[PDB]
Amino acid sequence: TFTEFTNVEEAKKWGNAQYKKYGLSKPEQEAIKFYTRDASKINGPLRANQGNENGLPADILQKVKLIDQSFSKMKMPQNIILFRGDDPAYLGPEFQDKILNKDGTINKTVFEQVKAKFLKKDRTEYGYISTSLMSAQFGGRPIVTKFKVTNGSKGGYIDPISYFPGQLEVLLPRNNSYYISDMQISPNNRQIMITAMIFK
């Protein structure tokens, strides 16, 4: 069974209880905080260099190593549901500009091609994955992903050290493969809903 938090008070309670056990060092905490300030400064270079840490500028490499090292301390204590909102660029360059009709609705014909590319297949990203324990904040995004993450999987609640407290952010490792088990158009026809699974 996967736990889904429906209320901020309960979500903060859970997250804080786990965060207290991490014992992240000061350099680990500073590298994660730097990431939260603007994830693009880390995920950008990682995409640019196709995950090859040796190509990163020395200062970014150092932050990547500390964040990577921090996941030795951060594991999910139970099966849990996490959320991420995305823009059309997430689907790739061949879809970015065709997936939405002029009126903001999802193009049903192109969506069939998106399914063909992604549905029941794995995908791996070069960047770390930022999610939230709650979905509310992603309500107006064109793509919302619900990640089902199993107990024991790497990942941590970092809200207490985030630059932007209250986002209820859970950070997942980079180069992290997930399986897309479902994709649907939402009832209002203006959103794509993706279900993805992570087991490590």
Swiss-Prot record:
Name the site position(s) for Transition state stabilizer: 169
Q: Which residues form the active site?
A: 84, 130, 169
Q: Does the keyword Secreted apply?
A: yes
Subcellular compartments: Secreted
**Enzyme Commission numbers on file:** 2.4.2.-
GO-annotated cellular components: extracellular region
Name the family the entry cites.
Answer: To exoenzymes 3 of C.limosum and C.botulinum D phage, and to S.aureus ediN.
> What does the protein in this record do?
ADP-ribosylates eukaryotic Rho and Rac proteins on an asparagine residue.
Q: What is this protein called?
A: Mono-ADP-ribosyltransferase C3
Which organism is this entry from? Clostridium botulinum C phage (Clostridium botulinum C bacteriophage)
